[PDB]
Design a protein around this ligand. Structure first.
Ligand code: HEM
Ligand code: HEM
Ligand SMILES: Cc1cc(N)nc(CCc2cccc(CCc3cc(C)nc(N)c3)c2)c1
Ligand SMILES: Cc1cc(N)nc(CCc2cccc(CCc3cc(C)nc(N)c3)c2)c1
Ligand SMILES: C[C@H](O)[C@H](O)[C@H]1CNc2nc(N)[nH]c(=O)c2N1
Ligand SMILES: C[C@H](O)[C@H](O)[C@H]1CNc2nc(N)[nH]c(=O)c2N1
Ligand SMILES: [Zn+2]
Lengths: 406, 405
């Protein structure tokens, strides 16, 4: 065959070669000596910026089928002259739209990519206060939430400037429950959010005392202290959780919010960096039902639920963890459906990712995918992705992790 | 240089320094990770000699006699043999050390906490496929032990540059026939269609059940392979029943007791053992989840779920996840009832976590393959899911090798 990775699906016996990886311009964490594929995180001046800009502009003109043309070479020229005199440059409106989608398309760890082409891109590159950031975010939440008929969106605030503070959103997600450190070492609420909760209270937030207290937003305009904003409750749609047949489940008082809106990622496009570009899609049920509710280091509710189920938790072989997790996941789906709020179960999501893989094979000759992340945390081999070999690599545009602002 | 390895459940951190002793390139490069690929697509005296030096070193260190007379003189012996003959031979205790280390170094094995408890049968004085069969039967009888399974390996003659390999054609010592039917269908185990046809082409009379224990096709150098039927009484099987669902037993589902891989090459200090079958015991997900629920194996999930009267019309009723658990439960219960060793995936991974700990203290790390160590149901309900892992190749090692046909 060719000298590109051969890629096998073991369920179906089919083979593809990934030619897209040749486009990768950035090294990941692996070497021939050892694979670091399972680590969650592993570790601008003119020369560097310009070639990255050049690459992206090429990408753009390729996508509108005008590669090599006059409008393409002039834009190239327009870019290098702007870098020549200010040291940075700016994207045209449709370039941002293209690059933002491309970043979602390029994201190895997102199972939701069948939807990449359908993203609402809000340009907020005129935003100039923390207050204004709030407004923008509120509009984003209203739009995307669409009373339950969730719609994918991204709001792009202004880019990193040479010696100028960043636009940052301190919260890792637009909606997050509080995590209060107790005197008995324990945590009331979401243990994932202890630090940000503590940051909020330090910046003047009067705290609650519940397992599902919605956090305020800490929003930071350049060179300024972060300002604190409460989201009006009518804007934050939540779903109380109940089970289709286990009647007692409604009595646990569990709930989740509708809009999964990540806010601490860096969005890189042709070398430009947008430190505040929160984006939102809709949940896969396992995120809430398996990770958020059952992780030993989150809500940790598995024992509570299995007791109500009257299962034998004294021993592992009764599969009590497995039984409860299934019921909790099904409660997530049932309650989301009932409330008429968009959700996708881990089966549908994975099937649709297989179709996305097939599209991308036809379109780009491959698709970067992080197997450990794409395969769900329950019912793994029950879904088709488990049986699909994946190649992982960094394409740009991209979303990156970035340091916390404090 | 040294990767930072983090457990996200507990926030704890370690550093793998062991991976520096890796001498053998895997499939990844800085440009792209290939960690999810299942397989990768006389060695000049210099190379055999240095792999051998390294192995002997490991061995004399393992017995704390590193640098003594017996150490130097055994290096002499190896230097003498390679120089004269282009190869050398292992002493039984060294072979015994090698095997255990190959198990220890197996990144895709969740059972390594047991790595030091391994019965090693030297079969290197085997000259016929007939003799291989005798050895294979003793191994089975030993390893099964009336249901109280004991880890074991039998090691057949090494490879030799002149000649064909000693090989076991079957991929496990015990396997159920897969028969392709006219109607594109498969009766029995779809993984074993090829090997069933081979048996038939070499004169096996096939049954036609869903669970026909296949015969061994055993091959001595440069001779046609030979057919040998395992005496039904050496093959312990467990019928499947369910703790609460009375109807489950009527499905007539069954699985064998002894998981005994037989197609992997074992490399020790540069010598290659092309037939070296090994067995431990099962982890339930292998039978309950993969073997019975894989769409391309027995594929029983729909059947079961209908028995359970679940809504099969839609994915969001979680009929697959619900049926899957019942099947893994049926498996554990049935083995526990039949007094045959089995570990559920919670117990197994908890113990693997501990093994990761022992190895850290012992060696500065543990090569591990995250995609294989995390079980195929309830991944994140297990501690291994939250554990970062460094994968690489240490020697002694089990490798894959081509099919002998
Ligand atoms: C439309 C519905 C969507 C679904 C069902 C979905 C699904 C997921 C899931 C399950 C994860 C794993 C996260 C975790 O386990 O914590 C993920 C990661 C990710 N998602 Fe999506 N997503 C969707 C929309 C989007 C959108 C609109 C974007 C951005 C435009 C996006 C970008 C990403 C990125 C960049 C990651 C990687 C995060 C990391 O590196 O840790 N997704 N996605
Ligand atoms: C004693 C109990 C044992 C348990 C519970 C256990 C468990 C497992 C499991 C679940 C796998 C993945 C299996 C699959 O999905 O196909 C595996 C792989 C493996 N096991 Fe173990 N194992 C045990 C003993 C042993 C022994 C005795 C050896 C050899 C001395 C061994 C060597 C290996 C090797 C080399 C692999 C890697 C297979 C590959 O790379 O394809 N294991 N083990
Ligand atoms: C749009 C969207 C849809 C969906 N269904 N789920 C999500 C959640 C994805 C998600 C969740 C937590 C966290 C991240 C980014 C991880 C992350 C990022 C940074 C900057 N630092 C860290 N320490 C960790 C991404 C997002
Ligand atoms: C010792 C042991 C214990 C246990 N619980 N299960 C097993 C079975 C695991 C098992 C089964 C078939 C085969 C292998 C490795 C050989 C192997 C070889 C090739 C070419 N492809 C594969 N997918 C696998 C491993 C073995
Ligand atoms: C150690 C491991 O990389 C880590 O636990 C990963 C595994 N896979 C995951 N997959 C998804 N989708 N989300 C996650 O948070 C994780 N966690
Ligand atoms: C393609 C993917 O790597 C493949 O399906 C792997 C995943 N993890 C596995 N894990 C185990 N234990 N056994 C397997 O066969 C597999 N298959
Ligand atoms: Zn890798």
């Amino acid at each position: 065959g060719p000298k590109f990775p051969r890629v096998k699906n073991w369920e179906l016996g089919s083979i593809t070669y990934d030619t897209l990886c040749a486009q990768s311009q950035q090294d990941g964490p692996c070497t021939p000596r050892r694979c670091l594929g399972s680590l969650v995180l592993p570790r601008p001046p003119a020369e560097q910026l310009l070639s990255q800009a050049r690459d992206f502009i090429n990408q753009y003109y390729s996508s509108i089928k005008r590669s090599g043309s006059q409008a393409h070479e002039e834009r190239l020229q327009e870019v290098e002259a702007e870098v020549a005199s200010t040291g940075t440059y700016h994207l045209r409106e449709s370039e941002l739209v293209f690059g933002a989608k491309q970043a979602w398309r390029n994201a190895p760890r997102c199972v939701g990519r069948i939807q990449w082409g359908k993203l609402q891109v809000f340009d907020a590159r005129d935003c100039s206060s923390a207050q204004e950031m709030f407004t923008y975010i509120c509009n984003h939440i209203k739009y995307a939430t669409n009373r339950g008929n969730l719609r994918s969106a991204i709001t792009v605030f202004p880019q990193r400037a040479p010696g100028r503070g960043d636009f940052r959103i301190w919260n890792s997600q637009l909606v997050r429950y509080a995590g209060y450190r107790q005197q008995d070492g324990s945590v009331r609420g979401d243990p994932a959010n202890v630090e940000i909760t503590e940051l909020c209270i330090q910046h003047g937030w009067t705290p609650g005392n519940g397992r599902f207290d919605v956090l305020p937003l800490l929003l930071q305009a350049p060179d300024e202290a972060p300002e604190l904003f409460v989201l009006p409750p009518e804007l934050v749609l939540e779903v109380p959780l109940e089970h289709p047949t286990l009647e007692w489940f409604a009595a646990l008082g569990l709930r989740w919010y509708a809009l999964p809106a990540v806010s601490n990622m860096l969005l890189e496009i042709g070398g430009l960096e947008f430190s505040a570009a929160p984006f939102s899609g809709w949940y896969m049920s396992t995120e809430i039902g398996t990770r958020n509710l059952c992780d030993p280091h989150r809500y940790n509710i598995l024992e509570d639920v299995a007791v109500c189920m009257d299962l034998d938790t004294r021993t592992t072989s009764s599969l009590w963890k497995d039984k409860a997790a299934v019921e909790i996941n099904l409660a997530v789906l049932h309650s989301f459906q009932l409330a008429k709020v968009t959700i996708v179960d881990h089966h549908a999501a994975t099937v649709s990712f297989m179709k996305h893989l097939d599209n991308e094979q036809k379109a780009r000759g491959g698709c970067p995918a992080d197997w450990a992340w794409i395969v769900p945390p329950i019912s793994g081999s029950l879904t088709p992705v488990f049986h699909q070999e994946m190649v992982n690599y960094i394409l740009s545009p991209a979303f990156r992790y970035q340091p916390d602002p404090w």
